[model samples]
Structure formats: structure tokens, C-alpha cells
Target chain A: HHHMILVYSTFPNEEKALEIGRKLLEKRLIACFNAFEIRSGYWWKGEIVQDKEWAAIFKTTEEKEKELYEELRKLHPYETPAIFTLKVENVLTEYMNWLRESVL
Target chain B: HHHMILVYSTFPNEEKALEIGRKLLEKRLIACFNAFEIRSGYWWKGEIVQDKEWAAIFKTTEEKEKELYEELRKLHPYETPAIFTLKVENVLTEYMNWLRESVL
Candidate 1:
């Protein structure tokens, strides 16, 4: 029941990434989080929008996946957010142990 | 043997990244690669160390996985670098197909 997952999302800037990341850290909904500058293109409504963006990768468990997902949707800025989850196959054991222990 | 995998690695800056990435591209060992800024923590020696890193994600086929992994280990700057792989459960069809066709 402690299966892990990664929550991936994009934001317009670092401030939003920090804001969203801070909230999750405080909530203990994620074991760890990372953010970076990226250029992305995705289908938005009827158009493929290309923009310079900040991408965030949040580490959490499948147990908290839904809760964390709903929370992210509430926290994200866009009408339909670019947030999704991916199954984490394996990470470094040291980091994975840290991740497992960090989340509730 | 075409199952996809993501090879993750961290670098101090970008020249080393571009250098290693160029090799992978020229060799067709990976379908796609993305680089991003990240703050990461891992256990090294007996300490939990944190550093700002350029985290890379290289998408490649299962067949090319070991070939790319060894190439990364050979090219990485650190004697004991943070290089690993993760199973990709699902990816965007367009992107996935692009990935499948991009590698050797």
C-alpha cells in the first residue's frame, strides 16, 4: 500500500513553483520536490501552446496520490492545470528510503 | 524488448551535460533528453548531502538501456555519479511514438 508516484506539473514562474511546493511540503503530502526551468509545448484547449516554464516533480506515495492531486488542482493557477501522476519504478535505495520515511 | 526507460542523472552545471548529451544523440542511444534545474538530496558516504543540479531525463528503449547507461557512467564527471533508470508506465502517445522512433 506504500506504492510511490511522481506528480509532474508546470508553472509560469519560480514563484508559483515555490508557492505550490511549499504548500505540499508543509502538508507532508510529498516526500520530496524538485523544480527547474524548461521550455514546454502542450495542447491547451484547441491550440498547442509553447512557452518557457518551470517544471516541478513532486515525490509522493499512491496512498496520498488522490489527496495530493486534488490539493494541487486547487493550488494550481490554470483553469485546467497541466498536472498528472506517473508510477515510480525504482529510485536509489538511499533516496527511496528517505522518500518513504518522509511521507505519511 | 522495446519497453521504454528513463535514465536520470545529475550534473553540477551544463557543459558536462551538453557534452554527454551530444554523445548520446550522435550515437542514437536515446530517443529524447530533457535537462532541468533541481535541488537534490542523497546519501553519500554516511551523510545526507544536498546540491543544486541539472537533472537530466533520457528516454530510450529497453534494448538501448544498458548501452546508454554505461555511456553515462563513462562520461559522468563524478567518480560516483548519481545515475539511474526508472520504468516508464505511460507517456503521451505522440511523445512516446516520437521516442520509440528516435532511438536506435
Candidate 2:
């Protein structure tokens, strides 16, 4: 099987981010998750906008992508929330194995 | 609405950490979330502490702040987990909009 990968999304604040993170972990649907605060700028609709928000990242196995995506959609609050997945290109062997084992 | 920002937090282990990440992503409560394992040091309660923990970052719109916080509180494992949010000052135009839309 292909190595599992990482997924990420951002929330409006720390509370929402953590809430989602906690649920995913409790279910063992992912190997790990992290959240952080950051500044972001971009054009939305038709104008430039900037605001404060929270971000979340998840590590999981390749086979679990569908289930992971489904669960996130059910719990998310936005009409449509951003979600992206990236394959692990390189990582410490021990850490990578640990991630795989942790999920299994 | 203002451009969205990012949020982040850390957890004790990968299992609990990933669980949180998945739930947040599945729900569309956030624009994006990222997770990483790192060594951290901080003061908790009244003592100094150090541990290897998984961190999660979330990005979301400003309007969603309250919901984000409430949800995280319900799901977090720690009696009190570290949660923080910051307003974004600057970001690439394309990347920023990509985030906002993904979560919209």
C-alpha cells in the first residue's frame, strides 16, 4: 500500500479547530493532528480581505481517505470548508513507521 | 466578511491528535488544517513541562470564531488545551482565496 498522507484545513478560531481535532483523534481515524494561528490575506468574492483564523492538519493512512473526508464534512460548520490531502514524499523512517502503526 | 486567518494547538500523542484533525476536516468547520510532530516546552498549571506532541493548525473565516471555540472545548482531551487565534496581516492573493473558497 502507498504510504499514508497528510490533510489540512483552517477554522475561524482555536476553539473550532481544537474541537474538530479532538473528535478525529478520539475515533482513531487519523494518526495525528495539529492546529495553529496565523495571518492570511487574499481576494474573496470581488475584494481583498484579511482576518484572523485557525488552521488544522492531519496525518493518516492512504486507505482511510474516503472515511476521513466523510467524517470531516459531517462535522464541519462552513457551507463549504477547505480540505486538501498531500502524500508523504519523505520523512524519517522511524517517525513514518510510527505514524503508520499509530493509525493501525 | 474579512479574509480568514489561522489557528493552532498541540497534543500529547499522535492518536488523539489525528482524531481531532479528521473530525475538523470532515465537518467543513475550517478552511484547512495542518499537523506536525514537534518537541515543545511550556509552563502548565504551575510547573514546567516538556514533551513530544502533535500540533494542528486551522484556517477559517472570522465569523466562525465562536463556533470553532465551543466545538474544540467539547472535544479536547486536556482539561485545558492550548488554543490560540491570530488575525492575518498578509498572504499571497491566490493562496488566500483558495483557502477561503475551500472552506466556504
Which residue pairs collide in model 1, if any?
Answer: none
For candidate 1, write residues A1-104 as lDDT tens digits: 33668789988897788678778866778865678888888777799999898888877767788889899989989787788877666555454555666665
What would the per-residue lDDT of candidate 2 be over residues B33-92, giving only the tens digit for each residue?
777665443333434344468877778776666667667767888665655554466777
Q: Candidate 1 has what TM-score?
A: 0.64
The local distance difference test score of each candidate is 0.75, 0.68
List model 1 lDDT by residue over B21-100, tens digit each: 88999999997788866865443454444557787898888888778867887787776554556776767777767777
TM-score of each: 0.64, 0.49
Report the TM-score of the second chain of model 2 against its true counterpart: 0.82
RMSD of each: 5.4, 16.4
Q: DockQ of candidates 1 onward, in order?
A: 0.25, 0.03
Q: Best-fitting candidate, measured by TM-score? A: 1
List native contact recovery per candidate, as a fraction of 1. Answer: 0.29, 0.00
